[PDB]
Coordinates of C-alpha atoms in Angstrom, one line a residue:
Chain E
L1 CA 7.5 -31.2 -31.2
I2 CA 4.9 -33.7 -30.2
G3 CA 6.3 -35.9 -27.5
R4 CA 9.6 -34.0 -27.4
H5 CA 11.3 -32.6 -24.4
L6 CA 12.8 -29.1 -24.5
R7 CA 15.4 -27.8 -22.1
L8 CA 14.8 -24.1 -21.9
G9 CA 17.3 -21.5 -20.7
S10 CA 16.0 -18.8 -18.5
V11 CA 16.6 -16.6 -15.5
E12 CA 14.4 -14.3 -13.4
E13 CA 13.8 -11.0 -15.1
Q14 CA 10.5 -9.4 -14.0
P15 CA 7.9 -9.3 -15.5
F16 CA 9.0 -11.7 -18.1
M17 CA 10.0 -14.4 -15.6
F18 CA 9.8 -14.7 -11.8
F19 CA 11.7 -17.6 -10.2
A20 CA 10.6 -18.8 -6.7
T21 CA 13.7 -20.0 -4.8
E22 CA 11.6 -22.0 -2.3
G23 CA 8.1 -23.4 -1.8
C24 CA 7.7 -24.9 -5.2
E25 CA 8.9 -27.7 -7.4
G26 CA 10.0 -28.0 -11.0
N27 CA 8.2 -25.9 -13.6
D28 CA 5.9 -24.4 -11.0
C29 CA 8.7 -22.4 -9.6
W30 CA 8.4 -20.2 -12.7
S31 CA 5.8 -17.6 -13.6
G32 CA 5.5 -14.5 -15.7
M33 CA 4.8 -13.4 -19.3
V34 CA 7.4 -15.7 -20.9
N35 CA 6.3 -18.6 -18.7
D36 CA 2.7 -18.1 -20.0
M37 CA 4.0 -18.1 -23.6
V38 CA 5.9 -21.4 -22.9
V39 CA 2.9 -23.0 -21.3
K40 CA 0.7 -22.2 -24.3
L41 CA 3.4 -23.3 -26.7
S42 CA 3.7 -26.6 -24.8
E43 CA -0.1 -27.2 -24.9
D44 CA -0.4 -26.4 -28.6
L45 CA 2.8 -28.2 -29.8
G46 CA 2.7 -31.1 -27.4
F47 CA 6.2 -30.9 -25.9
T48 CA 7.3 -31.2 -22.3
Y49 CA 9.9 -28.9 -20.9
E50 CA 12.1 -27.8 -18.0
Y51 CA 14.0 -24.6 -17.3
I52 CA 17.7 -24.5 -16.8
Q53 CA 19.5 -21.5 -15.4
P54 CA 23.1 -20.7 -16.2
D55 CA 25.4 -21.3 -13.3
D56 CA 27.1 -17.9 -13.9
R57 CA 23.6 -16.3 -13.8
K58 CA 24.3 -14.1 -16.8
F59 CA 22.4 -13.4 -20.0
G60 CA 25.5 -13.7 -22.2
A61 CA 28.1 -11.8 -24.0
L62 CA 31.2 -12.5 -26.0
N63 CA 34.5 -11.8 -24.2
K64 CA 36.8 -10.3 -26.9
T65 CA 39.9 -11.3 -24.9
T66 CA 39.1 -15.0 -24.7
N67 CA 36.6 -15.2 -27.6
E68 CA 34.3 -17.1 -25.3
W69 CA 30.6 -16.7 -24.4
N70 CA 29.1 -16.9 -21.0
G71 CA 25.5 -17.0 -19.6
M72 CA 22.5 -18.5 -21.3
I73 CA 24.1 -18.0 -24.7
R74 CA 27.0 -20.2 -23.6
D75 CA 24.7 -22.9 -22.2
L76 CA 22.9 -23.0 -25.6
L77 CA 26.1 -23.2 -27.5
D78 CA 27.2 -26.0 -25.2
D79 CA 24.0 -27.9 -25.9
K80 CA 22.8 -27.7 -22.3
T81 CA 19.6 -26.1 -23.6
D82 CA 17.5 -26.3 -26.7
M83 CA 16.1 -22.8 -26.6
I84 CA 16.5 -19.6 -24.5
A85 CA 13.0 -18.5 -23.3
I86 CA 13.4 -15.0 -21.9
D87 CA 13.4 -11.4 -23.1
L88 CA 16.5 -12.1 -25.3
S89 CA 17.5 -8.9 -27.1
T90 CA 18.6 -9.1 -30.8
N91 CA 22.2 -8.0 -31.4
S92 CA 24.8 -8.8 -34.1
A93 CA 27.3 -10.4 -31.7
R94 CA 24.7 -13.0 -30.6
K95 CA 23.5 -13.4 -34.2
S96 CA 27.0 -14.5 -35.2
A97 CA 26.6 -17.5 -32.8
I98 CA 22.9 -18.3 -32.5
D99 CA 19.6 -17.8 -34.2
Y100 CA 16.5 -16.0 -32.9
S101 CA 12.9 -16.8 -33.1
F102 CA 10.2 -14.5 -34.5
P103 CA 10.2 -11.5 -32.1
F104 CA 7.6 -10.9 -29.4
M105 CA 8.3 -7.3 -28.4
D106 CA 10.1 -4.1 -29.6
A107 CA 12.6 -2.5 -27.2
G108 CA 15.1 0.3 -27.0
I109 CA 17.9 1.5 -24.7
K110 CA 16.8 3.8 -22.0
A111 CA 18.8 5.7 -19.4
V112 CA 17.3 6.8 -16.1
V113 CA 18.5 8.8 -13.0
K114 CA 17.1 9.6 -9.6
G115 CA 16.2 13.2 -8.8
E116 CA 14.1 15.7 -10.7
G117 CA 15.6 18.3 -12.9
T118 CA 18.8 16.6 -14.1
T119 CA 21.1 18.8 -16.2
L120 CA 22.0 15.8 -18.3
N121 CA 20.5 15.8 -21.8
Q122 CA 22.2 12.8 -23.4
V123 CA 24.3 10.0 -21.9
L124 CA 27.5 10.9 -23.7
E125 CA 27.5 14.1 -21.6
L126 CA 28.4 11.9 -18.7
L127 CA 32.0 11.7 -20.0
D128 CA 32.5 15.5 -19.5
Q129 CA 31.4 15.7 -15.8
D130 CA 31.9 14.0 -12.4
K131 CA 28.7 14.8 -10.5
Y132 CA 27.1 11.6 -11.7
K133 CA 28.4 8.1 -11.9
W134 CA 26.8 5.6 -14.3
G135 CA 26.8 2.0 -15.4
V136 CA 25.4 -1.0 -17.3
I137 CA 25.1 -4.6 -16.2
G138 CA 27.9 -6.9 -17.3
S139 CA 27.2 -9.6 -19.9
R140 CA 23.8 -8.1 -20.8
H141 CA 22.6 -6.6 -24.1
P142 CA 22.9 -2.9 -23.4
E143 CA 26.6 -3.3 -22.5
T144 CA 27.1 -5.1 -25.8
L145 CA 25.2 -2.6 -27.9
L146 CA 27.2 0.3 -26.5
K147 CA 30.5 -1.5 -26.9
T148 CA 29.8 -2.3 -30.6
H149 CA 28.4 1.2 -31.5
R150 CA 30.4 2.9 -34.3
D151 CA 30.9 5.9 -32.0
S152 CA 33.6 4.7 -29.6
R153 CA 32.5 7.2 -27.0
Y154 CA 29.9 4.7 -26.1
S155 CA 32.6 2.2 -25.4
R156 CA 34.1 4.8 -23.2
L157 CA 30.9 5.0 -21.3
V158 CA 30.9 1.3 -20.6
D159 CA 34.6 1.0 -19.8
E160 CA 34.6 4.0 -17.5
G161 CA 31.3 3.2 -15.8
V162 CA 30.4 0.9 -12.8
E163 CA 30.0 -2.7 -13.8
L164 CA 26.7 -3.7 -12.3
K165 CA 26.1 -7.4 -11.3
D166 CA 22.4 -7.7 -12.1
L167 CA 19.2 -5.9 -12.2
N168 CA 18.7 -5.8 -8.4
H169 CA 22.2 -4.3 -8.0
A170 CA 21.6 -1.7 -10.7
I171 CA 18.3 -0.6 -9.3
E172 CA 19.7 -0.4 -5.8
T173 CA 22.6 1.8 -7.1
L174 CA 20.1 4.0 -9.1
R175 CA 18.0 4.5 -6.0
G176 CA 21.1 5.5 -4.1
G177 CA 21.2 8.6 -6.3
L178 CA 23.7 10.6 -8.5
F179 CA 23.7 7.5 -10.8
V180 CA 22.6 7.0 -14.4
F181 CA 21.6 3.4 -15.1
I182 CA 21.5 2.5 -18.8
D183 CA 19.3 -0.5 -19.7
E184 CA 16.2 -1.5 -21.6
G185 CA 12.8 0.4 -21.9
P186 CA 10.4 -2.4 -21.0
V187 CA 12.4 -3.7 -18.1
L188 CA 12.7 -0.2 -16.6
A189 CA 9.1 0.6 -17.3
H190 CA 7.9 -2.4 -15.2
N191 CA 10.5 -2.3 -12.5
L192 CA 10.6 1.5 -11.8
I193 CA 6.8 2.1 -12.0
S194 CA 6.6 3.2 -8.4
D195 CA 9.8 5.3 -8.4
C196 CA 8.2 8.7 -8.9
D197 CA 11.6 10.4 -8.4
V198 CA 13.3 8.5 -11.3
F199 CA 13.5 10.2 -14.7
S200 CA 14.7 9.6 -18.2
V201 CA 18.0 10.9 -19.5
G202 CA 17.5 11.8 -23.1
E203 CA 15.3 9.7 -25.4
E204 CA 15.4 6.0 -26.1
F205 CA 18.0 5.0 -28.7
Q206 CA 18.7 1.9 -30.8
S207 CA 15.8 -0.3 -32.0
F208 CA 15.9 -4.0 -31.3
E209 CA 13.6 -6.9 -30.5
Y210 CA 13.0 -9.4 -27.8
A211 CA 12.9 -13.0 -29.1
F212 CA 13.8 -16.5 -28.0
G213 CA 17.2 -17.8 -28.8
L214 CA 17.7 -20.9 -30.9
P215 CA 20.7 -22.9 -31.9
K216 CA 21.7 -22.7 -35.5
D217 CA 19.9 -25.5 -37.5
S218 CA 17.4 -26.1 -34.7
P219 CA 14.8 -28.5 -36.0
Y220 CA 12.2 -26.6 -33.9
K221 CA 12.7 -23.0 -35.2
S222 CA 10.0 -23.2 -37.9
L223 CA 7.3 -24.3 -35.5
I224 CA 8.3 -22.0 -32.7
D225 CA 8.4 -19.0 -35.1
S226 CA 5.0 -19.8 -36.6
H227 CA 3.4 -20.1 -33.2
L228 CA 5.0 -16.9 -31.9
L229 CA 3.8 -15.0 -34.9
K230 CA 0.3 -16.3 -34.3
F231 CA 0.5 -15.2 -30.7
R232 CA 1.3 -11.7 -31.8
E233 CA -1.3 -11.6 -34.6
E234 CA -4.0 -12.9 -32.2
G235 CA -3.2 -10.3 -29.6
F236 CA -2.0 -12.8 -27.0
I237 CA 1.3 -11.0 -26.4
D238 CA -0.5 -7.7 -25.7
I239 CA -2.8 -9.5 -23.3
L240 CA 0.1 -11.0 -21.5
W241 CA 1.9 -7.6 -21.2
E242 CA -1.2 -6.1 -19.8
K243 CA -1.5 -9.0 -17.3
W244 CA 2.1 -8.9 -16.1
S245 CA 3.4 -5.4 -16.4
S246 CA 2.5 -2.6 -13.9
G247 CA 0.2 -0.9 -13.4
Chain Z
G1 CA 26.2 -23.5 -44.4
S2 CA 28.8 -23.8 -47.2
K3 CA 26.6 -22.0 -49.7
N4 CA 26.9 -18.2 -49.6
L5 CA 25.8 -15.5 -52.1
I6 CA 29.1 -14.7 -53.8
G7 CA 28.6 -14.8 -57.6
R8 CA 25.0 -15.7 -57.3
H9 CA 22.3 -14.0 -59.4
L10 CA 19.2 -13.3 -57.4
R11 CA 15.7 -12.7 -58.8
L12 CA 13.9 -10.3 -56.5
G13 CA 10.2 -9.9 -56.4
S14 CA 9.0 -6.3 -56.1
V15 CA 6.4 -3.7 -57.2
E16 CA 6.2 0.0 -56.9
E17 CA 5.1 1.1 -53.4
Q18 CA 6.3 4.5 -52.4
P19 CA 8.6 5.3 -50.5
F20 CA 9.9 1.7 -50.4
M21 CA 10.1 1.3 -54.2
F22 CA 9.6 3.6 -57.2
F23 CA 9.5 2.0 -60.7
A24 CA 10.1 4.1 -63.7
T25 CA 8.1 3.0 -66.7
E26 CA 10.2 4.6 -69.5
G27 CA 13.7 6.1 -69.9
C28 CA 15.5 3.4 -68.0
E29 CA 16.6 -0.2 -68.3
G30 CA 16.9 -3.0 -65.9
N31 CA 17.8 -2.3 -62.3
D32 CA 18.1 1.4 -63.1
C33 CA 14.3 1.6 -63.3
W34 CA 14.1 1.1 -59.6
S35 CA 14.8 3.4 -56.7
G36 CA 13.7 3.9 -53.0
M37 CA 14.3 2.7 -49.5
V38 CA 14.2 -1.0 -50.4
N39 CA 16.3 -0.5 -53.5
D40 CA 19.0 1.2 -51.3
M41 CA 18.9 -1.8 -49.0
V42 CA 19.3 -4.3 -51.9
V43 CA 22.2 -2.3 -53.4
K44 CA 24.1 -2.4 -50.1
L45 CA 23.3 -6.1 -49.6
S46 CA 24.5 -6.9 -53.1
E47 CA 27.8 -5.1 -52.5
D48 CA 28.5 -6.7 -49.2
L49 CA 27.4 -10.2 -50.1
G50 CA 28.6 -10.3 -53.7
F51 CA 25.5 -11.1 -55.7
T52 CA 24.0 -9.6 -58.8
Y53 CA 20.3 -9.2 -59.1
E54 CA 17.2 -8.2 -61.1
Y55 CA 13.7 -7.3 -60.1
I56 CA 10.7 -9.3 -61.3
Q57 CA 7.1 -8.0 -60.9
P58 CA 4.1 -10.2 -60.7
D59 CA 1.8 -9.8 -63.7
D60 CA -1.2 -9.6 -61.4
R61 CA 0.4 -6.7 -59.5
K62 CA -0.6 -8.2 -56.2
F63 CA 1.3 -8.6 -53.0
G64 CA -0.2 -12.0 -52.3
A65 CA -2.9 -13.8 -50.5
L66 CA -4.3 -17.3 -50.2
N67 CA -7.5 -18.1 -52.0
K68 CA -9.6 -20.3 -49.7
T69 CA -11.6 -21.6 -52.7
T70 CA -8.7 -22.8 -54.8
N71 CA -5.9 -23.1 -52.1
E72 CA -3.6 -21.2 -54.4
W73 CA -1.5 -18.1 -53.8
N74 CA -1.2 -15.0 -56.0
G75 CA 1.1 -12.0 -56.3
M76 CA 4.7 -11.9 -55.3
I77 CA 4.1 -14.7 -52.8
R78 CA 3.1 -17.0 -55.7
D79 CA 6.1 -16.0 -57.8
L80 CA 8.4 -16.9 -54.9
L81 CA 6.7 -20.3 -54.4
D82 CA 7.0 -21.0 -58.1
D83 CA 10.7 -20.3 -58.1
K84 CA 10.4 -17.2 -60.3
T85 CA 12.1 -15.3 -57.6
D86 CA 14.5 -16.0 -54.7
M87 CA 13.4 -13.2 -52.3
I88 CA 10.6 -10.7 -52.1
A89 CA 12.3 -7.3 -51.6
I90 CA 9.5 -4.8 -50.6
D91 CA 7.5 -3.8 -47.5
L92 CA 6.2 -7.3 -47.0
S93 CA 4.0 -7.6 -43.9
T94 CA 4.3 -10.6 -41.5
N95 CA 1.1 -12.6 -41.3
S96 CA 0.3 -16.2 -40.3
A97 CA -1.2 -17.1 -43.7
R98 CA 2.0 -16.2 -45.5
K99 CA 4.1 -17.8 -42.8
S100 CA 2.4 -21.1 -43.6
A101 CA 3.9 -21.0 -47.1
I102 CA 7.1 -18.9 -46.9
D103 CA 9.7 -17.6 -44.4
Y104 CA 10.5 -14.0 -43.5
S105 CA 13.8 -12.3 -43.1
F106 CA 14.8 -10.4 -40.0
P107 CA 12.3 -7.4 -39.9
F108 CA 13.3 -3.9 -41.0
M109 CA 10.3 -1.8 -39.8
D110 CA 7.4 -2.0 -37.4
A111 CA 3.9 -1.4 -38.8
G112 CA 0.2 -1.4 -37.8
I113 CA -3.1 -1.2 -39.5
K114 CA -4.4 2.4 -40.0
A115 CA -7.8 3.5 -41.1
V116 CA -8.3 7.0 -42.6
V117 CA -11.4 8.9 -43.7
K118 CA -12.4 11.8 -45.9
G119 CA -15.7 13.5 -45.1
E120 CA -17.3 16.5 -43.5
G121 CA -20.0 16.1 -40.9
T122 CA -20.4 13.2 -38.5
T123 CA -17.4 11.0 -38.5
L124 CA -16.4 7.6 -37.1
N125 CA -14.4 6.5 -34.1
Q126 CA -13.7 2.8 -34.9
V127 CA -13.9 0.9 -38.1
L128 CA -16.6 -1.6 -37.0
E129 CA -19.1 1.4 -36.8
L130 CA -19.0 1.2 -40.6
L131 CA -21.3 -1.8 -40.5
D132 CA -24.2 0.1 -38.8
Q133 CA -24.4 3.1 -41.2
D134 CA -24.5 4.1 -44.9
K135 CA -23.0 7.5 -45.0
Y136 CA -19.4 6.2 -45.6
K137 CA -18.3 3.6 -48.0
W138 CA -15.0 1.8 -47.2
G139 CA -12.5 -0.7 -48.6
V140 CA -9.3 -2.6 -48.4
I141 CA -7.0 -3.6 -51.4
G142 CA -7.5 -7.2 -52.5
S143 CA -4.7 -9.7 -51.9
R144 CA -2.8 -7.3 -49.7
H145 CA -2.0 -7.7 -46.0
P146 CA -4.7 -5.6 -44.3
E147 CA -7.4 -7.7 -46.1
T148 CA -5.8 -10.9 -44.8
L149 CA -5.5 -9.6 -41.3
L150 CA -9.1 -8.5 -41.2
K151 CA -10.3 -11.8 -42.8
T152 CA -8.2 -13.8 -40.2
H153 CA -9.3 -11.8 -37.2
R154 CA -11.2 -14.0 -34.7
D155 CA -14.0 -11.3 -34.5
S156 CA -15.8 -12.1 -37.8
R157 CA -17.3 -8.7 -38.0
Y158 CA -13.9 -7.8 -39.5
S159 CA -14.6 -10.3 -42.2
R160 CA -17.9 -8.6 -42.8
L161 CA -16.0 -5.3 -43.3
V162 CA -13.9 -6.9 -46.0
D163 CA -16.8 -8.8 -47.6
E164 CA -19.1 -5.7 -47.7
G165 CA -16.5 -3.1 -48.7
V166 CA -15.6 -1.8 -52.1
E167 CA -13.0 -3.8 -54.0
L168 CA -9.8 -1.9 -54.4
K169 CA -7.3 -3.0 -57.0
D170 CA -4.1 -1.3 -55.8
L171 CA -2.7 1.6 -53.8
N172 CA -3.4 4.2 -56.6
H173 CA -7.0 3.1 -56.9
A174 CA -7.5 3.1 -53.1
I175 CA -6.0 6.6 -52.7
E176 CA -8.1 8.0 -55.6
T177 CA -11.2 6.4 -54.1
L178 CA -10.4 8.0 -50.7
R179 CA -9.8 11.3 -52.3
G180 CA -13.3 11.1 -53.9
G181 CA -14.7 11.5 -50.4
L182 CA -17.1 9.8 -47.9
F183 CA -14.8 6.9 -47.8
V184 CA -12.7 5.0 -45.2
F185 CA -9.5 3.3 -46.5
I186 CA -8.1 0.7 -44.2
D187 CA -4.3 0.0 -44.9
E188 CA -0.9 0.4 -43.2
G189 CA 0.5 3.1 -41.1
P190 CA 3.8 3.8 -42.9
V191 CA 2.3 3.6 -46.3
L192 CA -0.4 6.1 -45.5
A193 CA 2.0 8.4 -43.6
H194 CA 4.1 8.8 -46.6
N195 CA 1.5 8.9 -49.3
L196 CA -1.2 11.1 -47.6
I197 CA 1.1 13.7 -46.2
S198 CA -0.5 16.6 -48.1
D199 CA -4.1 15.4 -47.8
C200 CA -5.2 17.9 -45.2
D201 CA -8.8 16.7 -45.5
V202 CA -8.0 13.1 -44.6
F203 CA -8.3 12.2 -40.9
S204 CA -7.8 9.1 -38.7
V205 CA -10.5 6.6 -37.7
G206 CA -9.4 5.5 -34.2
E207 CA -6.0 4.3 -33.2
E208 CA -3.7 1.9 -35.1
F209 CA -4.5 -1.7 -34.4
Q210 CA -2.6 -5.0 -34.9
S211 CA 1.2 -5.1 -34.5
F212 CA 3.3 -6.7 -37.3
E213 CA 6.5 -6.1 -39.2
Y214 CA 7.8 -5.4 -42.6
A215 CA 10.4 -7.9 -43.7
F216 CA 11.7 -9.6 -46.9
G217 CA 10.1 -12.8 -48.0
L218 CA 12.2 -16.0 -48.4
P219 CA 11.3 -19.5 -49.6
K220 CA 11.4 -22.2 -47.0
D221 CA 14.8 -23.8 -46.8
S222 CA 16.5 -20.9 -48.6
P223 CA 20.3 -21.3 -48.3
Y224 CA 20.5 -17.5 -48.2
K225 CA 18.3 -16.7 -45.2
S226 CA 21.0 -16.7 -42.6
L227 CA 23.2 -14.2 -44.4
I228 CA 20.3 -11.9 -45.4
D229 CA 19.1 -12.0 -41.7
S230 CA 22.5 -11.2 -40.3
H231 CA 23.0 -8.3 -42.7
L232 CA 19.5 -6.9 -42.1
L233 CA 20.0 -7.0 -38.3
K234 CA 23.3 -5.1 -38.8
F235 CA 21.5 -2.5 -40.9
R236 CA 19.0 -1.9 -38.1
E237 CA 21.6 -1.9 -35.3
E238 CA 23.8 0.6 -37.2
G239 CA 20.9 2.9 -37.8
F240 CA 20.9 2.5 -41.6
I241 CA 17.2 1.7 -41.8
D242 CA 16.4 4.9 -39.9
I243 CA 18.6 6.9 -42.2
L244 CA 16.9 5.5 -45.3
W245 CA 13.4 6.2 -43.8
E246 CA 14.5 9.8 -43.2
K247 CA 15.9 10.0 -46.7
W248 CA 12.9 8.6 -48.6
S249 CA 9.7 9.3 -46.5
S250 CA 7.9 12.6 -47.1
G251 CA 8.6 15.5 -44.7
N252 CA 6.9 18.7 -43.7
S253 CA 3.2 19.0 -44.5
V254 CA 1.3 21.9 -46.2
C255 CA -1.3 21.1 -43.6

């Protein structure tokens, strides 16, 4: 990678990435755990880089009607980027189209709700009541995992829930009450740290990883993987999580 | 790309390491000698991907480490590098030394380093305390992952731990030494969880430390990595790996 230039797909997703929309130029508009990883990779491997956001602002899912991707996944497949540098969850749908780097973090699906003492014990119970609404964000990993689960009652949850635009919309809706938001543990841990009236619904389920996304046959995968493994082994990832997560 | 596994015959590196693999030494032939969590994964992969297979054990019965004097590997890693095997099918820990020489599949389990101790009286809170006392002896198994992680660690007191500890040949030798008392064995969480379940007089030394994964080992440029990775990810996503851990790992505790 010495001398090379990498186009990196990314979007804001706190605390992994923060994007300043004003008051900055170029790479300096970006900060966060993933940015710190990229900066260290660029120093050690000798590449320059820039970040490219998807125009549709989505992470990426496969639309089964059109058989087309959107989001950062689509930008990668379209060769607009060389790597996706974000908390990119591992799932089989994506794995059919792209590769993943060595992982940097473990993660699970977590469901949360406002108000102490919820009667809900498990998310499928939502289908048998009408006190609570619920939802997942469109074109993001949790939606895909639930839609591909062997138990099609999870597809019902997705199909019958509110389609949320983005993390801000989801958290707003959650804070509005009587609403179960289903998303990812680490993201919820950070972003709801001060919401003392928000509680888990059931236990976390599904085990997956956060990694970077790479095109199949990327000439850079070996080096990125080696360096990411070293980051984990040396404790750098843990140090960055402590730096960036609340708190 | 074009190459797939249909009709291929894979040679798989493995050794006994309960509950991942059990190897019967009599009364069986060939693949039928093997059982366990990893064997169940291999069987399912073979059916879905269309290969036949056999297991090949290293004569040295080592997992594999890099000798800094000779710059040569040993164990299953060496057999893979020497084309005796096509994949290492075991609880193979991810570390940077191995990553310099081989690739890994998609991971099937998370793991950490765990230290355990047998002994009455004063005890220990963290493994580096071992260096400033002589009540307890201690050890790691040679040419296995925990030894490599401790020798790699940027705090060279962990290299001291390895260099000044007792040499342990294999997991059976380590566990018998631990059971002998006044000993700290430093190894891996899942292995110790399963194998020490009924040792009510064995306790922890501090918290687990280091994060790594168990995966399968693949040679660089293997034409089979993409398929194995996809299928392993599907196993994880479908909950198959969790079901196999429940099936094979020890339950209850007399303790």
